[PDB]
């Protein structure tokens, strides 16, 4: 599997979305998987679930990596309203679109964020619900907020450079061995491709902070089965969340990764798979 | 499987061991895992693991439920050291007089400390590590102690009853529509049929406290691939400790059960034996 | 000053309260402060603050020492919403026929909701606020609830007796030494005195349950500067929602005393009537 | 008050220590409270208690603000063991040099791991202990490590920059307001005054890492009062420390500051001040 050979493009319209272009990568042909990215400059659906599209889609699944929007190959947007609920009325768009009736979603930090928001809004469209260090659900009883890796997003957004990518990076992965020329030099593309979502990424969260992101207050609402995924050395989300989600979420179950950051999917990549597609099969 | 097909018995000699008896049930004949039991009164390895030997030995696992010194149809002993280490020789003991030359441990509460002790002191005796609420590592972050659990543990040995033993059940247990009368009756007759294994535990516990048990400063010794399991509603062992053994542990990973108090393998047996059986065979 | 000498009643008028007799105690002449008790059967404003109200009536502060609706020498009532509120509610009607422009709040446990709800409705009617382990703010992040010591109130609430009475008090305090004879039969003689409190009380919570208490949402309005008190070995209120408070809260801060139950007042009195008067003086 | 009316010099002789030369800035002349630096680039008695030196002057005490071995105006050294041991060992020497039979210990970060070591080798010479925020006390339950500030700290040291400094003054302070003209170029000039103890500092780190200070282990021999202090925004040395301090200490309490880093003495100086003060005279 490659990016190129998975490469799709569907229109959307749902809200306030009219003919709005959402880039997604697919292979496979089994129940669905929808997952969903990160929020830091350059992410997108390919790139965050690299390690894990092909061992799904060996174990039965069909695997989407969506694009958000205002990201990668999506449509430029700027956002008024908070973006999990955006983001997952955009994937109930790209659901109508493509006749899918019901999705397991995998999210991480913007994107569990998505899916949290999504399993509220349409619980009848959701199968199960993975959550990876999930973003946005408000402040943490022992982490000082923004957090260090949520400073350096934003200071990459502002003054997009090399160097500050090279740093952001060193600060999502525990092992920094990780970081190739290749993988430094195509999130760099992806920067470069599209400078204005770095633009209107930064206008957006002037038009809803972070505090409007936080729907802890609805989690009891969730009736989806939960696994929720945390790394143990995450400087962007606070561990702690993972305890909140635990404590609020009907039918949910935590595990930790060590020596980790915020992706479990690149660092356990193996693990990751393994637990996460048990979970989808037996639970 | 039953508890009498499986019975067996062996006659230990390590370290102040002299022809002590320890009974264990024994099922399957591929590699072997010694499950360990916690330390309330009439615990034992058959009722601990009653749900998951059958599975473990599906699985293709040679499963030995050990009865640990002083409880159940193992021999009387008052222990003047703390309990994990005496426990882990025993373990040693019974590997070295059945030729099992490495062992994977399972081991809850004082089972879990037994497993650390065990892991400590026999690098090389030792597969993987399997560690279920271990009791003994020192103070909590939050809880107060001595927990509310180990409060009427101590409750039940001193003054043993019927209607004692229903209490510490309805502690032990998230569900307590798990307390059967069956089981009940069960738990009953272990504290019955032995007697001065309770007066024993109370005259251990006096020369050997539970601070005694604290191996936290040589968790970092610990070379074992180590998967923590926590209870999220366990009132005998703080959730805090899973965290604790996951900053300290080299290779360790923490899965921490909702609904469920100490007996994850009880309460979630089938969600447990699928990662403890998949731990196994790939991590 | 003693009970006797300090006790008057008064009838008030707000919101559902019509001619509604509300019992308290009054020393001194100064500033207003209204001290607020918890929840358990035999609760009420004497026995909570018997060490604190001379302290600070030397201090030059006029202590009120309020019976809130339901408990102890105040009109029985039976609620259908949330405690707190409702005797937010009947502080300012206390207020009102007093003549008491703005007075600072020490409220414990269910005070300590009472003293939030109060905040949040009548904020130009509050000066500070003192939290001394508040009731009712959602789940813990790490204590299974209920708590330990609620169970012990909801079983005196059920089957008051002597024996129950004594074993909810031993859960109380870390010094159980402060259980004397004196203060035992007298908080028997305020459950004996006035059965109805506790049926009335187990009927309001099945129509209001603990949930209904949280308004962690709202904590952002609170615009009163705030101190935050907790006992290390309180088993009644999780000692993570004192960070709770602390991250929620704009202009708080967080004692937390060693060796101490839920009554810091009373196990601490000294320390604790230090700290509270320096910051009404000084903060 | 003036840095340059209260410096003194005295050369110290004790253990490792031959005629080694410490630098203090001394006040007032009733009981004797040593105050202890913190461990960044630039570090010193005087900068670190400018807000806090005079209101205890006017309490009635004589204030030593002493710099450590390897900080501002005191020799140049490298180390080979821990930090805290070493500068306790100084602080020891300074006192028996000055005559002061028992002192007070403030101590922030590296200067709460000095007054530690203090209290466990030489418990007879400490009064009370006052611990801002102590480093090396060993992993967080929750805060990756090293930290964001520990980070920017040994940045520092390896690339002394104007800009860096800046970086690292914008983390250490929850209000970046204070972070004037004059603070600023002072910090700065105390870096380009002694660069020999930069290269001095990264070495010692290599030669004793932030493990070697740890001393959780020991906490149950100290005897003396002791006050633990937070901020609850410190990026540098993780809240949970707290918390650690306060159950392994047998007669502690613990203040958190809100909207505070690591230097609650700067940031709520008038508070700290009051607190400290009152725990010295009454506690
Ligand atoms: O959601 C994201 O942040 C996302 O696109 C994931 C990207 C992974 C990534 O850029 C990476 C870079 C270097 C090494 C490993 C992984
Ligand atoms: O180590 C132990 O505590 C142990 O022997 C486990 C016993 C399980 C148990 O007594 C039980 C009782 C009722 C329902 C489910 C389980
Ligand atoms: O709000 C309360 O729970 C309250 O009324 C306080 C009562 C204190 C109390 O009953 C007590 C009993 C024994 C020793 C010390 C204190
Ligand atoms: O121990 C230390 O880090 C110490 O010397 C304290 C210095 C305070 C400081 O540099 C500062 C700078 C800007 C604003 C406020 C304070």
Redesign the interface.
């Known amino acids: 599997l490659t990016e190129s050979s998975t490469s799709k493009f569907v229109k959307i319209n749902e809200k306030g979305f009219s003919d709005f272009n959402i880039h997604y990568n697919e292979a496979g042909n089994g129940e669905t998987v929808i997952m969903l990215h990160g929020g830091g400059p350059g992410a997108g659906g390919w790139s965050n679930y690299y390690r894990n599209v092909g061992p799904f889609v060996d174990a039965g699944y069909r695997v989407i990596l969506k694009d958000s929007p205002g990201f990668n190959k999506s449509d430029a947007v700027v956002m008024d309203e908070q973006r999990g609920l955006v983001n997952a009325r955009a994937v109930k768009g790209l659901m109508d679109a493509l006749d899918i009736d019901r999705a397991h979603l995998v999210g991480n930090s913007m994107g569990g964020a998505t899916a949290l928001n999504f399993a509220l809004e349409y619980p009848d469209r959701i199968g199960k619900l993975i959550l990876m260090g999930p973003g946005g659900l408000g ?6 907020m923004p957090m ?1 890796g949520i400073k350096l997003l934003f200071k990459l957004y502002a003054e997009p450079s090399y160097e500050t990518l090279k740093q952001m990076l060193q600060v999502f992965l525990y092992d920094q061995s990780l970081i190739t020329e290749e993988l430094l030099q195509g999130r760099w593309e992806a920067i470069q491709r599209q400078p204005e979502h770095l633009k209107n990424f930064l206008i957006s969260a002037q038009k809803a902070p972070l505090s409007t992101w936080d729907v802890t ?1 609805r989690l009891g609402e969730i009736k989806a089965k939960t696994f929720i995924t945390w790394g ?4 962007f989300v ?3 969340h993972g ?2 989600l ?13 020596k980790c950051g915020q992706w479990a999917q690149w660092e356990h990549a ?2 990751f798979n ?2 996460v597609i ?1 979970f989808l099969r ?2």
């Open positions: 402040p943490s009883m022992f982490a000082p260090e207050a143990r050395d995450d400087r606070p561990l702690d305890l909140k635990l404590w609020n979420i009907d039918d949910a179950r935590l595990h930790v990764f060590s193996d693990e393994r637990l048990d037996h639970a």
